[PDB]
Amino acid sequence: GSSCWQSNSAYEINMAMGRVVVSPDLPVGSVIATKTWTMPDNNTIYVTCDRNTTLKSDAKVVAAGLVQGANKVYSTAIPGIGLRFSRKGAISMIYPDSYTTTGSSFRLAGSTFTLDIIKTSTTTGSGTLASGPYTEYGPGFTILKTSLNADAITIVSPSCTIL
């Protein structure tokens, strides 16, 4: 059997979006905010093998406190706040998914990575998203990772209270 190792450390995207204010008029399911990062088409090899090998790469959402709902939208610890991760380019997929190809050297195809903030419920809460990993793509090991720092995405929907 073939052996495949990781020739280079993973490509990383910090998904910092800053402060976002949710409008009450925004209908359910629609986009609150979106952000797109590009990765230039590269000569760098992330996976290398000894033989010609057929590999299956999985696109994984790994962040704790995220449950997958319908249409690949992930609910949050923040009420009525959804997340959708997508990649567009030569290889295009909405997380989660998996890609299969064959070769002995493997590059990352120049592409765009897109984070979507979705309105899950008619009533939306407030808060800051947790620090750490969110996305992991690779053939049994991460070659493409997306994550957040502290205070990189703050969602503030104005509340109407009783008096």
Coordinates of C-alpha atoms in Angstrom, one line a residue:
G1 CA 0.0 0.0 0.0
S2 CA 1.0 3.6 -0.7
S3 CA 2.1 6.1 2.0
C4 CA 1.2 9.8 1.8
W5 CA 2.7 12.5 4.0
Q6 CA 2.2 16.3 4.3
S7 CA 4.8 18.2 2.4
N8 CA 3.8 21.7 3.7
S9 CA 1.9 23.1 6.7
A10 CA -1.7 23.9 6.1
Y11 CA -3.0 27.0 4.5
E12 CA -4.9 29.2 7.0
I13 CA -7.6 31.8 6.8
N14 CA -8.4 34.0 9.8
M15 CA -12.2 34.7 9.3
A16 CA -12.2 38.1 11.0
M17 CA -15.4 40.0 10.0
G18 CA -15.6 42.6 12.8
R19 CA -18.8 44.1 14.1
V20 CA -22.2 43.2 12.5
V21 CA -25.6 44.7 13.2
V22 CA -28.7 42.6 12.3
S23 CA -31.7 44.4 10.9
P24 CA -35.1 43.3 12.2
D25 CA -36.6 43.7 8.7
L26 CA -34.2 41.1 7.2
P27 CA -36.3 38.0 6.3
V28 CA -35.5 34.5 7.6
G29 CA -33.0 32.6 5.6
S30 CA -31.4 35.7 4.0
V31 CA -27.8 36.7 4.3
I32 CA -26.9 39.1 7.2
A33 CA -23.2 39.4 6.2
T34 CA -20.7 37.7 3.9
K35 CA -16.9 37.7 3.5
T36 CA -14.7 36.1 0.8
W37 CA -11.0 35.3 1.0
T38 CA -9.0 34.3 -2.1
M39 CA -5.9 32.0 -2.3
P40 CA -3.7 32.5 -5.3
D41 CA -3.1 29.5 -7.6
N42 CA 0.1 28.0 -6.2
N43 CA 3.0 25.7 -7.0
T44 CA 3.3 24.5 -3.4
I45 CA 2.7 20.8 -2.7
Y46 CA 0.7 20.0 0.4
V47 CA 0.4 16.2 0.0
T48 CA 3.1 13.9 -1.5
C49 CA 3.1 10.1 -2.0
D50 CA 5.5 7.4 -3.2
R51 CA 3.1 5.8 -5.7
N52 CA 0.3 7.1 -7.8
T53 CA -2.4 7.2 -5.2
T54 CA -6.2 7.8 -5.2
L55 CA -7.1 10.1 -2.3
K56 CA -10.3 11.2 -0.7
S57 CA -10.2 14.7 0.9
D58 CA -13.0 15.6 3.4
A59 CA -14.3 19.1 4.0
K60 CA -15.1 19.2 7.7
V61 CA -16.8 21.6 10.1
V62 CA -15.0 21.0 13.4
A63 CA -16.0 23.9 15.6
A64 CA -17.7 23.0 19.0
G65 CA -21.2 24.3 19.6
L66 CA -22.2 24.2 16.0
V67 CA -25.0 21.9 14.9
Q68 CA -25.7 21.4 11.2
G69 CA -29.2 22.4 10.2
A70 CA -30.9 22.4 6.7
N71 CA -29.1 23.4 3.5
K72 CA -25.6 23.1 5.2
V73 CA -26.3 26.0 7.5
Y74 CA -24.8 25.6 11.0
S75 CA -26.6 27.1 14.0
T76 CA -24.7 28.8 16.8
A77 CA -24.7 29.5 20.6
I78 CA -26.2 32.9 19.4
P79 CA -30.0 32.5 18.9
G80 CA -31.1 32.7 15.2
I81 CA -27.5 32.9 13.9
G82 CA -26.4 30.5 11.1
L83 CA -23.1 29.8 9.4
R84 CA -22.4 28.5 5.9
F85 CA -18.8 27.8 4.6
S86 CA -18.2 27.4 0.9
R87 CA -15.3 27.1 -1.5
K88 CA -15.4 28.2 -5.2
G89 CA -12.9 27.7 -7.9
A90 CA -11.5 24.6 -9.7
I91 CA -12.8 22.4 -6.9
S92 CA -16.1 23.9 -5.6
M93 CA -18.0 22.7 -2.5
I94 CA -20.3 23.8 0.3
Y95 CA -19.2 22.3 3.7
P96 CA -19.5 19.5 4.5
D97 CA -18.4 17.5 1.5
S98 CA -15.6 15.3 0.2
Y99 CA -13.5 15.3 -2.9
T100 CA -11.7 12.4 -4.7
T101 CA -8.7 12.5 -7.1
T102 CA -5.6 10.5 -8.1
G103 CA -2.0 11.5 -8.3
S104 CA 1.4 11.4 -6.5
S105 CA 1.7 15.1 -5.8
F106 CA -1.2 17.4 -4.6
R107 CA -1.5 21.2 -4.8
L108 CA -4.3 23.4 -3.5
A109 CA -6.3 24.8 -6.5
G110 CA -6.5 28.6 -6.4
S111 CA -10.0 29.4 -5.1
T112 CA -12.2 31.7 -3.0
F113 CA -13.3 30.8 0.5
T114 CA -16.7 32.3 1.6
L115 CA -18.3 32.6 5.0
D116 CA -22.0 33.3 5.1
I117 CA -23.9 34.7 8.2
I118 CA -27.5 33.6 7.9
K119 CA -30.6 34.7 9.8
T120 CA -31.9 31.4 11.3
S121 CA -34.9 32.8 13.2
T122 CA -37.2 35.8 13.1
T123 CA -35.7 36.7 16.6
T124 CA -31.9 37.1 16.7
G125 CA -29.7 37.3 19.7
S126 CA -26.3 39.0 20.3
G127 CA -22.8 37.9 21.1
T128 CA -19.2 37.2 20.0
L129 CA -18.2 33.9 18.3
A130 CA -15.8 31.5 20.1
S131 CA -12.1 31.5 19.4
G132 CA -10.5 28.6 17.6
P133 CA -10.8 26.2 14.5
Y134 CA -14.0 26.1 12.4
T135 CA -13.1 24.4 9.1
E136 CA -10.7 21.6 8.2
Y137 CA -10.1 20.2 4.7
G138 CA -7.7 17.4 3.8
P139 CA -7.2 13.7 3.1
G140 CA -7.2 12.4 6.8
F141 CA -5.1 15.5 7.7
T142 CA -5.7 19.2 7.5
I143 CA -4.1 21.0 4.6
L144 CA -6.7 23.9 4.6
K145 CA -7.9 25.4 7.8
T146 CA -10.1 28.3 8.7
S147 CA -10.5 29.8 12.2
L148 CA -11.2 32.8 14.4
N149 CA -9.3 34.8 16.9
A150 CA -10.8 36.5 20.0
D151 CA -13.3 39.3 19.1
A152 CA -13.1 38.7 15.3
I153 CA -16.9 38.4 14.7
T154 CA -19.3 40.3 16.9
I155 CA -23.1 40.0 16.1
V156 CA -25.2 42.8 17.6
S157 CA -29.0 42.6 17.0
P158 CA -30.9 45.4 18.8
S159 CA -33.5 44.1 21.2
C160 CA -37.0 45.4 22.0
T161 CA -37.9 44.9 25.6
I162 CA -40.9 45.5 27.9
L163 CA -41.3 48.4 30.4

